[PDB]
Amino acid sequence: VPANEQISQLASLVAASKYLRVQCERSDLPDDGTILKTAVNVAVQKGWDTGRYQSLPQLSENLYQGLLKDGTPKATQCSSFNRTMTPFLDAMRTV
Amino acid sequence: VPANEQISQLASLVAASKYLRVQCERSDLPDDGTILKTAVNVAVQKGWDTGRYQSLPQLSENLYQGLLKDGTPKATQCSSFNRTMTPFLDAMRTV
Amino acid sequence: RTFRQVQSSISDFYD
Amino acid sequence: RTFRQVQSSISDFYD
């Protein structure tokens, strides 16, 4: 599980959670920092070196903006993320 | 906590959960029967007589259709329900 | 106002 | 296709 993919993956989870919060009105989800914390906690649960996650915050925000101009409708992106994100969002519950 | 209000309340939780599922694309939420089960379980947790819940399924479905023609936008109804419904939706997780 | 009714009822419930 | 990329990545993660 190479570091750069670790980062793509985690940033995808971060970006999708923000998408949920804002585009799908998941008003139950917390701020971007707690979201980043979770992802980091999650990589640690996997014994991953989070000291290499310098680019993570920025890539996350770059993927989020990509999603907003992606042209897949919001109804669709929200159905998708609401379903696939559940374990991550459960993770957020303890941070 | 009179029976008829017990029913309004529970039906409101049922209707809002369906609203979430369909209007807010909460694809993580289950079918209408599990949703009804939860509400019933929840009234039992309160020691409520669920033998009086004959009208509940129909009132729930009537409140759901009211919500769809309510004219409050969906973005707004979803922000509201996503936040207030959290304990109920946690309840659904064990049924 | 179904929504207001419904959001109100949910509020009642969670006391 | 950011979404496809992102949904794919999420899928990868959950294996």
Residue spans per domain, chain B = 1-95
CA distances from C6 to A24, B43, B94 (A): 20, 17, 24
Q: Which residues of B touch C1 (CB under 8 A)?
A: 70
Q: Which technique was used to obtain these atomic coordinates?
A: X-ray
Query: Token pair for residue B35?
Result: 């949703």
For chain B, how long is the longest CA-to-CA vector? 36
CA distances from A38 to A35, A70, A88, B74, B88 (A): 5, 25, 8, 29, 24
Query: Token pair for residue B74?
Result: 């969906």
Closest CA to A16 of A60, A72, A73: A60
List Cβ neighbours of A83 (8 Å cut-off, separation of 6 or more).
Answer: B27, B28
One CATH from 1.20.1440.60, 1.20.58.1630, 3.90.1150.170, 1.10.10.10 for A1-95? 1.20.58.1630
Q: Do residues B17 and B85 lie in contact, with contact meaning Cβ atoms separated by under 8 Å?
A: yes
User: Which residues of C fall below an 8 Å CB-CB distance to B?
Assistant: 1-7, 9-14
Distance from C-alpha of A47 to C-alpha of A75, rounded to nearest angstrom: 35
Distance from C-alpha of B35 to C-alpha of B89, rounded to nearest angstrom: 9
Count of H-run helices and E-run strands, chain A: 5, 0
> Residue A31, by phi and psi: left (phi above 0), alpha (psi -120 to 50) or beta?
beta
Tokens 């939780």 label which residue? B13
Q: Which residues of A touch B25 (CB under 8 A)?
A: 24, 75, 78-79, 82
Q: Are A67 and D1 inside 8 Å of each other by CB?
A: no
Kindly tell me whether chain C and chain A come into contact, counting contact as 3+ Cβ pairs under 8 Å: no
CA angle B32, B33, B37 (to 5 degrees): 120
Q: Which residues of B touch A75 (CB under 8 A)?
A: 25
List Cβ neighbours of B68 (8 Å cut-off, separation of 6 or more).
Answer: B19, B23
Q: Which chains touch C (3 or more CB pairs under 8 A)?
A: B
Distance from C-alpha of B26 to C-alpha of A81, rounded to nearest angstrom: 9
Q: What is the DSSP letter of A50?
A: G
